[PDB]
Amino acid sequence: TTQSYTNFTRGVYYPDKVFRSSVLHLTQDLFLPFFSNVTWFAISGTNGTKRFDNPVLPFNDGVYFASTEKSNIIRGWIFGTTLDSKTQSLLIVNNATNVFIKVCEFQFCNDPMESESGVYSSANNCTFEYVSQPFLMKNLREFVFKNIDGYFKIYSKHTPIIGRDFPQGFSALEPLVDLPIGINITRFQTLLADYYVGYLQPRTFLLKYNENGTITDAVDCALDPLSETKCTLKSFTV
Amino acid sequence: EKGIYQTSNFRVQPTESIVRFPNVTNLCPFHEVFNATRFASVYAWNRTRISNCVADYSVLYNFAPFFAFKCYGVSPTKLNDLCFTNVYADSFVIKGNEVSQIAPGQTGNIADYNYKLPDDFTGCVIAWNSNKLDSKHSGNYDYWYRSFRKSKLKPFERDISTEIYQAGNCYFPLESYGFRPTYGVGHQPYRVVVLSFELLHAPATVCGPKKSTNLVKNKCVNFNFNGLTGTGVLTKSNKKFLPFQQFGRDIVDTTDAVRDPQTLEILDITPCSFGGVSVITPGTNTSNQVA
Amino acid sequence: SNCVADYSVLYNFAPFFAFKCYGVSPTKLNDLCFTNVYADSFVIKGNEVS
Amino acid sequence: NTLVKQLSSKFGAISSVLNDILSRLDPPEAEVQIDRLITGRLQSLQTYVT
Amino acid sequence: SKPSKRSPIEDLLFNKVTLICAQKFNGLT
Ligand SMILES: *[C@@H]1O[C@H](CO)[C@@H](O[C@@H]2O[C@H](CO)[C@@H](O)[C@H](O)[C@H]2NC(C)=O)[C@H](O)[C@H]1NC(C)=O
Ligand SMILES: *[C@@H]1O[C@H](CO)[C@@H](O)[C@H](O)[C@H]1NC(C)=O
Ligand SMILES: *[C@@H]1O[C@H](CO)[C@@H](O)[C@H](O)[C@H]1NC(C)=O
Ligand SMILES: *[C@@H]1O[C@H](CO)[C@@H](O)[C@H](O)[C@H]1NC(C)=O
Ligand SMILES: *[C@@H]1O[C@H](CO)[C@@H](O)[C@H](O)[C@H]1NC(C)=O
C-alpha cells in the first residue's frame, strides 16, 4: 500500500509541437517536481488483488503515473468529478487489441482470483467515443495525465528494464493523445483486472535538446541553488 | 562627396504564393448549428465542437441578416483565410436588451450568473432575432434564467444544479418564461452563438476554404502552411522530426521548418536574400559614374 | 458619512437597467473606504441614460 | 542575441508576428497592435545602439 | 611554411579565441 514518497527525478514531457535542436530551452509548465513526494502503491494498493478496496486518489491539477509490470493488471483508468453518475466520468480501457475511451454519467459498479468480468453496465448521457492503438502496447509504461483548457492531454513513454523498477537515466514522455473531454476531473481511480502516482506543479525547467528532436536532460530551477544558477545561465555547466 | 555611402537595402522579392491546406473536404456544420427549430436553455447552453472540416463562413450571410455580428480577436471579412486550433459553438437564446452583455469585459446578471466570457477573448458573438420561431400566443418556454447565484461563475463555466437561496427570504433557483408576438423588440428572444476560436500558429486541420497549389522548392516564394504565413525559400529537410512535431525553430525561436500538410515531408525555410546597398562615388565634381 | 458602506443591499433592492462604475469595480466596492461619498438622485428617460 | 530575442516579445500585443496581426485583423485594430510592436522594437534598437 | 604567414604565437592566439551571417539574419548584418 502507501510507501516511500520523496524521490523521483522523472516526469518531463515535450511541452509543445515545436522542434528544437542543440538548444537549451527554459520553459514554464506543470511538471512533476524533482524529488517530489510520489506515492508507491504492493499490488492493488490497499486491497489485495482479490480484495475490493481501492485508493480513489485525488487529481491535483495533473498526475504522473508509472506501472513496471508484465501482467498488465492496471490497463484501465477512470477519471472524474464525483464518480457516482451525478457528473460525467471518463473511462479508458485497454483490451489488448485497442484502447477504448468513452465519457458518460455512470455510477461506480464495483468494477475490479484470476477471473475476469465485464465493466461499465450503463451508458447514460454520453458525450463521445474514441478508439485508437493500445496505450500499453518489465515495461515502465510511464504516463502523464494533464487536464487544462478543455483538453485532457495524455503523454506516455515505454521502455523495458529487468534489474531495476525504473531506469536510472533520463527519459522524456511524448504526447500520445489530446482529447477535448471538457470535465473537471477533480479525482480519479484505476481499474485492476508497481503502481506509482505523483502530482504535477507549476514549475520552470531548463530542457536540453539533442541534435535530433529529443530531450536528453532537464534542470528543475527551484530544486537547489545550483539548479537555479544553471537556469539563470542557460547552461548545464556552471 | 567622394566616398562610400549606404543608401538603401535590397531584397529578393517572391515570384509566386504557395497555399498548402489540409486534404479534408468535409464541410463544417455551421448551418445546422445556426439553422434549427429548437435551442438549448441559457443556464444549460449547448457547446458543440467543430473539427476536421472546412470552416466556410459565407453560409452565415446566406442564413439570415443579423441583430449583431461582432468578432473581437479576428475580422469577420477575413475569417475564411484563417486556420483554428479549437473552434467551439456555444448556442443559447437571450433577450435583445441583454445581447450587449455577451462580450468580454461586461458586467451583468446574465454575464456573471450563467454565461461568462473571458476578458482575453478571441472569437465571435453572433445574434439574430428569433421572434418568428419562438413567438406563441399562449407563451413560450424558451427563457430560462438563474436570477440568483451563490458564487459568480468563471469564464465558460456552467452550473446545472438548482438550489434555493436563503437570505438568512426564499429566492427560487429558476425564473422561466415565454413571450407573445406583441412584445417589443427589446424583449424578444435572439438566438446567440459564440464561436470560440483558439489560434496557435497553424496547429490543426480546421481551415477556411482555400485552393491548394503545388509545392515549389529552391525559389523565393510566399507560403501559407495551414495558416502559417511567411516569405522564404523552401528546401528539403534532413532534420529528424518525430511524428509528433509539426514545426521547427532556431536558437532565437524563429520558425525555420514546417511539415507539409499533404505530404508530411519536413521543409526548411531559408530567408530570401537581403542586405545593404552601398554606393561608391568618385565625387560629383569629378565624375557621375558610380559603383 | 460616518457609516458602513454595505453595497449588497442594492442587489436586493432591484434588477437594474444599468449599473456601471468608472473608477472602481462594482464587485469589490465592499472592500474600499471613501473620502467623500455623495448620492445625486434624479429621474431621466431611458433614451438619455447613456 | 538579446536584440533578436526581443522580436519574439509581444509588448502587450496579441501576437509578436506582424503577419498574423495583418492576417486576422482589419486595418484599425492592426494599426493599434502594430504601434504596440513598433514601440517595443524601437525601444530595443535604441537600447542596443546606446 | 604556413598559409596566412603568421608566427607560431599568432597562430596560438588565433586558435584560442573563438563570413556569411547564417545566424541572426533578421536585418542584422
Ligand atoms: C540522431 O538520429 C540519428 C538517426 O537515428 C542517429 O544515428 C546516427 O546519425 C548520424 C547523423 O550524421 C549518422 O552519421 C550515423 O551513422 C547514425 N548512426 C546510426 C543510425 O546508427 C544519431 O546518432 C542521432 N543523434 C545523436 C546525437 O545520437
Ligand atoms: C530514491 O533513492 C533511493 C536511494 O537513495 C532508492 O533506494 C529509491 O528506490 C529511490 N526512489 C524510488 C521511488 O525508487
Ligand atoms: C433551416 O430553417 C428553414 C426554415 O427557416 C428550413 O426550411 C430548413 O429546412 C432548415 N434547414 C435545416 C438543415 O434544418
Ligand atoms: C446540441 O449539440 C449537439 C451536438 O452533437 C446536437 O446533437 C444537439 O442537437 C444540440 N442541441 C441543441 C438544442 O442545439
Ligand atoms: C492527401 O490526398 C492525396 C490524394 O492523392 C494523398 O496522396 C495524400 O497522401 C493525402 N495526404 C494526407 C495527409 O492525407
From TrEMBL, chain C:
Places the protein is found: Host cell membrane; Host endoplasmic reticulum-Golgi intermediate compartment membrane; Virion membrane
Record's comment on post-translational modification: The cytoplasmic Cys-rich domain is palmitoylated. Spike glycoprotein is digested within host endosomes. Specific enzymatic cleavages in vivo yield mature proteins. The precursor is processed into S1 and S2 by host cell furin or another cellular protease to yield the mature S1 and S2 proteins. Additionally, a second cleavage leads to the release of a fusion peptide after viral attachment to host cell receptor.
Family label: Belongs to the betacoronaviruses spike protein family.
Role noted for this protein: Spike protein S1: attaches the virion to the cell membrane by interacting with host receptor, initiating the infection. Spike protein S2': Acts as a viral fusion peptide which is unmasked following S2 cleavage occurring upon virus endocytosis.
Record note on quaternary structure: Homotrimer; each monomer consists of a S1 and a S2 subunit. The resulting peplomers protrude from the virus surface as spikes.
Entry note about domains: Fusion peptide 1 (FP1) and fusion peptide 2 (FP2) function cooperatively and have a membrane-ordering effect on lipid headgroups and shallow hydrophobic regions of target bilayers. They are considered as two domains of an extended, bipartite FP. The membrane-ordering activity is calcium-dependent and also dependent on correct folding, which is maintained by an internal disulfide bond in FP2.
Name recorded for this polypeptide: Spike glycoprotein
